[PDB]
Design a protein around this ligand. Structure first.
Ligand SMILES: NC(=O)c1ccc[n+]([C@@H]2O[C@H](COP(=O)([O-])OP(=O)(O)OC[C@H]3O[C@@H](n4cnc5c(N)ncnc54)[C@H](O)[C@@H]3O)[C@@H](O)[C@H]2O)c1
Ligand SMILES: [Zn+2]
Length: 325
């Protein structure tokens, strides 16, 4: 073909805003193909009073996207969808979108995967153990270390640990894990974001980075040794820093990415600064995968209230990465 192979969009939890966000792509010229139930997409468009012409995907049709059309790779829900109403019978459908999306991108049929939001509890309620797309894709591709990084114009925040109960965070953090996470972060910033010598600022685990060992020992026993190892590999880390002020910039503390030890240590600030522009990108897979930075927003499904800014940013980032692959 002439144009790039299209981006594949998993439409996510069907009762949530994922379908709505995919329908918002119909008015763009972004080269996207939607994985989802075609009847669902048509019915959601009707509920939203949108006039969209749907095409079924074919590899023998043009990769150039035209406004007003939406190309779909149909995957059938087990049961018809009611907006805002979770149905555990459709959890396997969601997992099929993830599995088919990973597989089709792995084979090069599509140039990148973008994920609309999924409802984790609904998947688990159906009997499918699931902590997030990030771990699902790591397992699918048999990659030991992947990194969740949220990115916006204000900042990039990578996580050492992702979806864990807070009780499990300290035991999950080892020096080796920090090293492997930051090695992947450094590699991606240099090779995929064009940052020649990344500067990475790293939070401590404990308040005030453990208060010189008086408020937890993990900085002394785990984090600082890991950062020393990374420095001696030539990776320009600074830390451990207190998370409550690390995100405040000054004339000298500039960095290319922050590392937070756990989910709620880093994501609240990032989403406060850039919720409607930020992208969740998974580092370390053999495919490009980006994501919205928000959840299913079930109460907004079918209501024309959700902001498509994160989805649009996620598609554009995936496109930019695919063009520079
Ligand atoms: N990438 C993903 O698949 C992903 C990411 C985050 C959360 N989730 C899942 O989503 C479900 C809901 O969790 P939550 O309630 O913590 O997250 P959420 O983002 O669904 O809701 C948080 C708040 O943000 C609002 N919101 C979310 N997206 C919005 C948008 N595009 N425009 C306007 N307002 C928006 C919601 O109305 C709500 O007030 C959970 O199952 C969670 O695991 C999935
Ligand atoms: Zn989360």
């Amino acid at each position: 073909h002439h144009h790039m192979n299209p981006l594949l969009i998993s439409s996510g939890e069907p009762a949530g805003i994922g379908p709505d966000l995919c329908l918002a792509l119909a008015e763009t010229d972004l080269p996207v193909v939607i994985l989802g139930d075609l009847s669902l997409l048509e019915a959601r468009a009707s509920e939203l009073n949108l006039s969209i012409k749907f095409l079924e995907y074919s590899p023998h049709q043009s990769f150039k996207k035209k406004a007003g059309y939406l190309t779909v790779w149909p995957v059938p829900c087990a049961a018809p969808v009611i907006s805002g109403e979770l149905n555990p019978q459709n959890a396997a459908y969601v997992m099929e979108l993830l599995t088919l999306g990973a597989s089709l991108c792995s084979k090069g049929e599509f140039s990148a995967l973008v994920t609309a939001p999924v409802h984790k509890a609904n998947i688990n309620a159906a009997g499918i153990t699931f902590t997030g797309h990030t771990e699902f894709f790591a397992d699918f591709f048999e990659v030991e270390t992947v990194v969740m990084m949220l990115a916006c114009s204000q900042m990039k925040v990578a996580l050492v640990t992702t979806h864990l109960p807070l009780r499990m965070v300290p035991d999950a953090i080892s020096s080796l894990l920090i090293i492997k996470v930051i090695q992947q972060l450094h590699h991606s910033l240099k090779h995929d974001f064009g940052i020649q010598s990344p500067k990475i600022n790293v939070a401590g685990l404990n308040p005030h980075a453990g208060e010189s060992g008086y408020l937890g020992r993990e900085e002394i026993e785990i984090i600082t040794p890991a950062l020393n190892t990374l420095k001696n590999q030539g990776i320009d880390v600074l830390g451990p820093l207190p998370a409550d002020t690390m995100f405040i910039t000054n004339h000298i503390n500039h960095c290319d990415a922050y590392v937070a030890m756990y989910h709620d240590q880093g994501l609240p600030v990032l989403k406060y600064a850039g919720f409607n522009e930020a992208v969740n990108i998974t580092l370390g897979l053999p495919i490009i995968r980006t994501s919205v930075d928000h959840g299913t927003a079930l109460e907004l499904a079918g209501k024309n209230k959700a902001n498509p800014g994160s989805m649009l940013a996620a598609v554009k980032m995936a496109k930019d990465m695919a063009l520079t692959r």
